[PDB]
Amino acid sequence: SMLVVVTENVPPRLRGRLAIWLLEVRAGVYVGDVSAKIREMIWEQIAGLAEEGNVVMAWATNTETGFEFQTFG
């Protein structure tokens, strides 16, 4: 499912890990199509590594709304 991650003021290590799975299309804006399991891995890395940064994750779902999101920071 499509996943977008938008970062601000996060440590370089998190930026690098996001880039394992996602394409950085603009500084701090990452996009990809990843499984639910990889999405949960990404959620975990953001929660653990964002420090004082701000992050938004948004991903496509087969629900009525059609997406879900989470903010961090």
Next chain:
Amino acid sequence: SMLVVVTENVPPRLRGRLAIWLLEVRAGVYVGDVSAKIREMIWEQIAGLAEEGNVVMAWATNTETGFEFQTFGLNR
């Protein structure tokens, strides 16, 4: 399909029009599930209004990549 729009340093007028269709979940980060027709309207507004700012659109597609995107503005 799912559409995300990320804006930086754009006029307030664009910010308001994006909210016609999309949910602003953080300042400058908009999300929704909208038709291709609505997405094209959004494309047109971003292109016409971004001015000195920077915008990214990303949307879900039925392709192997699974998404497409477009950047707009001063510093692509």
